[PDB]
Structures are given as C-alpha cells and as structure tokens.
Symmetry: D3
Subunit: 94 residues, 6 copies
C-alpha cells in the first residue's frame, strides 16, 4: 500500500566570533549521508544570537542549492548591524 513518510536530518552550526565581529555572511556546505531519495525541504533558524544594540538587529538565514546530496547553509546580516555570536539550526526532511 501507499503511505507518506519522511526521513529527516538536522544539525547546528555555531559561530563564536567575539572579540571580533562576525563576518557579514557565511556559507557552509552541508552533506547528507546517504543522499535523500527525494529532494528534501530544508528550513533554517537561530539557536543562539549575540547582537549589538548600537544599531538595528538584522539577521538572515536560509538553505540554498538544496539537493538530495546536501545544501548550502547560509547566513547574513546587512547594513550597520553588528553580530557578535550566533548559532544556526537546520532541519531537512523529504
């Protein structure tokens, strides 16, 4: 019979930048082992955050170039925002 089920993989990525401010952006190659059967959906959020109040809080994250074999874990702030630390979390399921 036909049933709908998912396989999920998940992970975190910690960036301890301070005493230096974090790079404006980061892109990390993540690999699924073994590859998924179907191209999975992937979402990303923040597990930890250390942002300076001297300017607005601007943070962004996403999963780019998602394939059955992996994806690019992306982060970026912009303009005058100063980020001191952060931890991205992500989950991918087909």
């Amino acid at each position: 019979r036909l049933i709908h089920v998912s396989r999920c993989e998940m992970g975190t990525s910690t960036h301890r930048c301070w005493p230096r401010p974090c790079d404006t952006s980061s892109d990390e190659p993540i690999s699924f082992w073994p590859p998924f059967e179907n191209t999975p959906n992937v979402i990303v959020s923040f597990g930890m955050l250390d942002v300076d109040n001297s300017n607005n809080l601007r943070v962004n994250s996403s999963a780019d170039d998602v394939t059955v074999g992996g994806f690019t874990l992306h982060y970026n702030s912009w303009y005058t925002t100063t980020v001191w630390n952060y931890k991205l979390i992500w989950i991918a399921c087909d």
Copy 2:
C-alpha cells in the same frame, strides 16, 4: 508489526515591509496537500529578522487552528516595537 513514523511538511513566509513598518500582526492560511492522516504538531520560528533598536524587541509566532488539512501561520509584535522585515519558518509532523 507496529512502528512509529512521521510525515513532515515545512515552509517559510517572507514579509518585506520596509520602507513601511510591518503590521502589528499577520495570519496566513497554510494548506497541507494531501491532508495528514493524523493531526500533526506544528512549530514556528524566525528565519529572518529586521527590528528597530529604538525600542524593545518583541516578536511572537505560532501555529493556530491546526487541523489535518492545514493551519494558520501567525505572527505579532506588540506595544512599541518596530519590525521592518521578517521571515517565518514552520514545520509540521505527525
């Protein structure tokens, strides 16, 4: 034999407001197709955030009215907070 398995669905919703401030709240209908066999659990977070530092950071998100066919993706700030941009992320599994 009896085994525990999950089907998962996930998605994101971007709100680009600036030059205008984002509305105090938003409620968006999300449909699952096909419907889940069981009422899934759903959780919501933020994938992107642009908040003004001139006041406290107040953000809230939730999955309301969750059924096998979908749910209401909810967001709200409150009091004096000013939000310029945000992206919600959500995942539903049974």
Copy 3:
C-alpha cells in the same frame, strides 16, 4: 528492504516573566513517550522573544543530555542582557 524513516516529536515552552526579568538560565526535563528506538537529534530555537534594548541581545538555547527517553530543554542569556519573555521551540527526530 532497508529504508530510511524518521519519527519526530516536537513542542514549545513559554516563559512569561514580565514585569520581572526572566531568570538568567532555565533547564526543563522533557520526556519522549514512548521512548525513541534510536537516540534522536534535537534542535531548539525561539518562537517568541522580548528583549530589552538597553543592552545587547544575547540569547542561547540547546537540547542537552539527549537520550531515547528524553532531554533537558536549555535556555540562557548572559552578562547584562535583560530578557522579559520568551518561548522556546524544539523538534527531535531519529
């Protein structure tokens, strides 16, 4: 045949502290019923957040002591950060 499937459990934990500031840290024991077959991965993020702008934003969360039977849902801010309210979200899949 051999296939990859996941079982997922998820939940949220709300802390309203206002007008008192939330404790610097929190640790909540979470149970998985029934226990997982394999030790799951767990990720944690924020569903709601209320942080004072008088100081930098510093929030941290994680799943600690993860077993098939459960885990410790952990939160903490640090230094001078003042947090007024927060809601943690978590998802665990094997």
Copy 4:
C-alpha cells in the same frame, strides 16, 4: 515522501478427518484484527495432504469474500476423490 509497504497476516488450518473422509468442502471465517487499511490480497495453499490413491487427486482452495475485516478460507475436493487429512495455509497482504 511516498513509499510502497505491506502489512501481512498469515495462518494455517488443520483438518484431521480420518478415520472419516473429510467433507467434500469446507468454509471457515477468518478475521483480521485489526482490520487492514486497504483490502488485502490473499492466497491459499496446502501445508499438509493425505489423499487416497484409489481415485484421482482433486483438491481446491481459495480465499473468498475478502474484505479489510477478513475472508472465507475455502476448500473443496470433487467427484470421486477421497481426502483423509489436510492443512491449509494462507497469507494476506495489502
């Protein structure tokens, strides 16, 4: 994702007739608990057989009235055949 899986149930039914000849036919109600999600297919054969050589060997079996709740395990010989003992086997899968 969509996958093909089967749930299977199976069983045997022994008929010790000797010293009397087995009835020309038999029909036994079989129940699946719990019921299947989809009507299963069912096949039936012989695990044991004791047939007289004074006439031709004529045996027949089938799964009749198959529903998600169960089916009728059917057996019959015909004409001049004499059967002294027999055991039916069956398996149902969706």
Copy 5:
C-alpha cells in the same frame, strides 16, 4: 533511522485443461506495476490440483527470471504424469 519493511504483490493463475491433459509445461510472464525498488524474492505453490492416479504425481513450479519489473511464472510435470487441472499461486516481496 534504518528499518526493514517489505512490499508484497501476489497472484494466482488457473489452468483448466480437462478433458485434455494440461501441457507438460507452462510459462507466463507476470508484471509488477509499479516495479519494486529492490529485486524481490518470489515463491510459488499450488492452490488447486487435479492429477490422474494411473501414474505418479509429479508437479513442479517456480519463479524464473525475477526482476524488479516482473518474472516468469513456471510450471511443469514430467515423465508419465497426467495433470488435468491446476492453479498456481505466487507471492513476491522485497
């Protein structure tokens, strides 16, 4: 997590030959739709049989050339055996 599951397909094939003896052998192509993910095992037996006592009972059956797409349902008697009617049953699982 990794788990062992099977998909099964099954079927029957009736050969009514009387008043003529059945052919010494038969080979029928069986198609699996959709094809299995992995090459399944297949076993074959007799659900009905009508054999003349004037000679020894000799019957044979098997699943030949098994692939994910199908196989050849084979039957044969040999030597002096005379078969009047028979029904084959088969089940394929991966």
Copy 6:
C-alpha cells in the same frame, strides 16, 4: 504516528532423492539475518512434489521453533507413502 508494516523473508528448499525414496522426515535450520524485531509468523508449502502412486499421498510440512533468529523447516511423510522428490517453500513475516 503508528502504522502496521511487515518485513518478510522467504525461501525454498529442494530435496532430490530419486531413485532412492526421500527420508521419512527432514528438519533444516533456517536463519533470518538480521533477526526480526518481533517473532514472525511462518507458513510452509510445497513448490515441487514427486509421489509414488502405489500408496496414498501423505505429505506434511511446518515451521517449528520459530524465533526472531530463525526456525526449523520441517517435513515428513508417513506410513507407506513413497516420496521421490520435493521442494518446500516458506515465507516469514512479522
């Protein structure tokens, strides 16, 4: 969520004896690798059979001592029955 699925294993076992009569009984250790998670059901039938017509046809088969690790594939004729060749088939599903 909870679903019913089976894992199945199957196999055949050929005994060529002619021109000598096959033994009155046979018992073969069958191993499931890897073991099942739950004690499976097992049914056994005949895929090939060669019985002398000088006496009644008497054949018997079963799966004895079934565990998650394996079982004893049993066969026996009785009294004056002469069996020349036979092939057992079996399928085990949990």
